[PDB]
Design a protein around this motif. Structure first.
Motif, PDB file in Angstrom:
ATOM      1  N   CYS A 115      49.921  31.454 -84.659  1.00 63.34           N
ATOM      2  CA  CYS A 115      49.255  32.420 -85.519  1.00 63.34           C
ATOM      3  C   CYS A 115      50.032  33.741 -85.523  1.00 63.34           C
ATOM      4  N   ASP A 116      49.660  34.628 -86.440  1.00 62.81           N
ATOM      5  CA  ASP A 116      50.221  35.974 -86.477  1.00 62.81           C
ATOM      6  C   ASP A 116      49.062  36.955 -86.409  1.00 62.81           C
ATOM      7  N   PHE A 117      48.927  37.607 -85.263  1.00 62.43           N
ATOM      8  CA  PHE A 117      47.818  38.505 -85.031  1.00 62.43           C
ATOM      9  C   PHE A 117      48.189  39.935 -85.387  1.00 62.43           C
ATOM     10  N   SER A 118      47.181  40.694 -85.779  1.00 65.16           N
ATOM     11  CA  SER A 118      47.366  42.038 -86.276  1.00 65.16           C
ATOM     12  C   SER A 118      46.163  42.833 -85.813  1.00 65.16           C
ATOM     13  N   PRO A 119      46.325  44.118 -85.519  1.00 64.63           N
ATOM     14  CA  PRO A 119      45.153  44.923 -85.147  1.00 64.63           C
ATOM     15  C   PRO A 119      44.058  44.790 -86.190  1.00 64.63           C
ATOM     16  N   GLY A 120      42.835  44.530 -85.714  1.00 69.06           N
ATOM     17  CA  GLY A 120      41.692  44.339 -86.573  1.00 69.06           C
ATOM     18  C   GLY A 120      41.286  42.892 -86.752  1.00 69.06           C
ATOM     19  N   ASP A 121      42.176  41.956 -86.443  1.00 66.35           N
ATOM     20  CA  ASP A 121      41.796  40.555 -86.390  1.00 66.35           C
ATOM     21  C   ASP A 121      40.721  40.327 -85.334  1.00 66.35           C
ATOM     22  N   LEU A 122      39.686  39.588 -85.716  1.00 71.59           N
ATOM     23  CA  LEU A 122      38.637  39.140 -84.808  1.00 71.59           C
ATOM     24  C   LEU A 122      38.998  37.761 -84.268  1.00 71.59           C
ATOM     25  N   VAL A 123      38.875  37.586 -82.952  1.00 72.30           N
ATOM     26  CA  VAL A 123      39.430  36.422 -82.279  1.00 72.30           C
ATOM     27  C   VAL A 123      38.506  36.020 -81.140  1.00 72.30           C
ATOM     28  N   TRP A 125      35.572  34.714 -75.351  1.00 71.84           N
ATOM     29  CA  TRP A 125      34.994  36.019 -75.670  1.00 71.84           C
ATOM     30  C   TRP A 125      35.361  36.444 -77.083  1.00 71.84           C
ATOM     31  N   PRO A 126      34.388  36.756 -77.937  1.00 73.68           N
ATOM     32  CA  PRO A 126      34.712  37.405 -79.217  1.00 73.68           C
ATOM     33  C   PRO A 126      35.381  38.751 -78.979  1.00 73.68           C
ATOM     34  N   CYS A 127      36.554  38.939 -79.585  1.00 73.54           N
ATOM     35  CA  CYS A 127      37.349  40.131 -79.338  1.00 73.54           C
ATOM     36  C   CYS A 127      37.921  40.659 -80.636  1.00 73.54           C
ATOM     37  N   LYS A 178      58.954  35.679 -70.939  1.00 71.82           N
ATOM     38  CA  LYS A 178      57.523  35.507 -70.700  1.00 71.82           C
ATOM     39  C   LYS A 178      56.777  35.145 -71.993  1.00 71.82           C
ATOM     40  N   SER A 179      55.539  34.679 -71.844  1.00 73.01           N
ATOM     41  CA  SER A 179      54.708  34.465 -73.024  1.00 73.01           C
ATOM     42  C   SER A 179      54.133  35.786 -73.524  1.00 73.01           C
ATOM     43  N   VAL A 180      53.971  35.877 -74.847  1.00 75.51           N
ATOM     44  CA  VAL A 180      53.379  37.059 -75.460  1.00 75.51           C
ATOM     45  C   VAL A 180      51.920  37.245 -75.038  1.00 75.51           C
ATOM     46  N   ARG A 181      51.560  38.488 -74.731  1.00 74.35           N
ATOM     47  CA  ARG A 181      50.171  38.868 -74.537  1.00 74.35           C
ATOM     48  C   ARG A 181      49.748  39.841 -75.632  1.00 74.35           C
ATOM     49  N   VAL A 182      48.466  39.791 -75.976  1.00 78.65           N
ATOM     50  CA  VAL A 182      47.897  40.628 -77.026  1.00 78.65           C
ATOM     51  C   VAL A 182      46.882  41.561 -76.390  1.00 78.65           C
ATOM     52  N   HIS A 183      46.891  42.819 -76.812  1.00 81.32           N
ATOM     53  CA  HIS A 183      45.867  43.765 -76.388  1.00 81.32           C
ATOM     54  C   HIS A 183      44.624  43.551 -77.256  1.00 81.32           C
ATOM     55  N   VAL A 184      43.491  43.228 -76.612  1.00 88.77           N
ATOM     56  CA  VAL A 184      42.233  42.952 -77.300  1.00 88.77           C
ATOM     57  C   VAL A 184      41.141  43.879 -76.785  1.00 88.77           C
ATOM     58  N   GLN A 185      40.177  44.145 -77.663  1.00 82.69           N
ATOM     59  CA  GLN A 185      38.932  44.843 -77.354  1.00 82.69           C
ATOM     60  C   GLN A 185      37.800  43.824 -77.391  1.00 82.69           C
ATOM     61  N   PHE A 186      37.100  43.660 -76.269  1.00 85.15           N
ATOM     62  CA  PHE A 186      35.961  42.742 -76.230  1.00 85.15           C
ATOM     63  C   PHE A 186      34.756  43.388 -76.897  1.00 85.15           C
ATOM     64  N   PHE A 187      33.966  42.582 -77.605  1.00 83.83           N
ATOM     65  CA  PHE A 187      32.714  43.061 -78.190  1.00 83.83           C
ATOM     66  C   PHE A 187      31.577  43.134 -77.169  1.00 83.83           C
ATOM     67  N   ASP A 188      31.849  43.619 -75.958  1.00 83.05           N
ATOM     68  CA  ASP A 188      30.836  43.779 -74.931  1.00 83.05           C
ATOM     69  C   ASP A 188      29.983  45.000 -75.278  1.00 83.05           C
ATOM     70  N   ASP A 189      29.051  45.357 -74.384  1.00 81.95           N
ATOM     71  CA  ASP A 189      28.146  46.475 -74.651  1.00 81.95           C
ATOM     72  C   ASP A 189      28.910  47.764 -74.902  1.00 81.95           C
ATOM     73  N   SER A 190      30.059  47.923 -74.273  1.00 83.20           N
ATOM     74  CA  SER A 190      30.970  49.013 -74.574  1.00 83.20           C
ATOM     75  C   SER A 190      32.343  48.398 -74.786  1.00 83.20           C
ATOM     76  N   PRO A 191      33.294  49.123 -75.460  1.00 84.32           N
ATOM     77  CA  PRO A 191      34.588  48.496 -75.797  1.00 84.32           C
ATOM     78  C   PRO A 191      35.508  48.277 -74.610  1.00 84.32           C
ATOM     79  N   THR A 192      35.365  47.164 -73.891  1.00 80.39           N
ATOM     80  CA  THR A 192      36.354  46.780 -72.884  1.00 80.39           C
ATOM     81  C   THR A 192      37.676  46.395 -73.537  1.00 80.39           C
TER      82      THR A 192
END
Ligand SMILES: [Mg+2]
Length: 100
Positions: A2-10, A20-22, A39-53
């Motif tokens: 896939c090609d991920f971009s800021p704002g993609d829900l994953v 986790w929905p992120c 190394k393998s690519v890592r993506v910075h994600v924000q979890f939809f937890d009670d606050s933005p983890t």
């Protein structure tokens, strides 16, 4: 792939956690991806937890978020959990999705 971009829900899988929905997130100093040599690519994600983890997740442990109604998200689906935090997160994610 896939090609991920800021704002993609994953959906994102971390060791020790259900899927986790992120939200793919641009870290304002360290960026969106960790792309180190060999190394393998890592993506910075924000979890939809009670606050933005925020955390980093292996790109190959991301999948597209397509609503709580999607087959993969319901019982027996790939992403299903009954944990309360996940149900709350799917709600937020569906809101985020319905904007788009
Ligand atoms: Mg909490």
């Amino acid at each position: 792939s896939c090609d991920f971009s800021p704002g993609d829900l994953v959906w994102a899988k971390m060791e020790g956690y259900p899927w986790w929905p992120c939200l793919v997130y641009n870290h304002p100093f360290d960026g969106t991806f960790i792309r180190e040599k060999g190394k393998s690519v890592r993506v910075h994600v924000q979890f939809f937890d009670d606050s933005p983890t925020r955390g980093w997740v292996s790109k190959r442990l991301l999948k597209p978020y397509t609503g709580s109604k999607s087959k993969e998200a319901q019982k027996g689906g790939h992403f299903y959990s009954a944990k309360p935090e996940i149900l709350r997160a799917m709600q937020r994610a569906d809101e985020a999705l319905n904007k788009d």
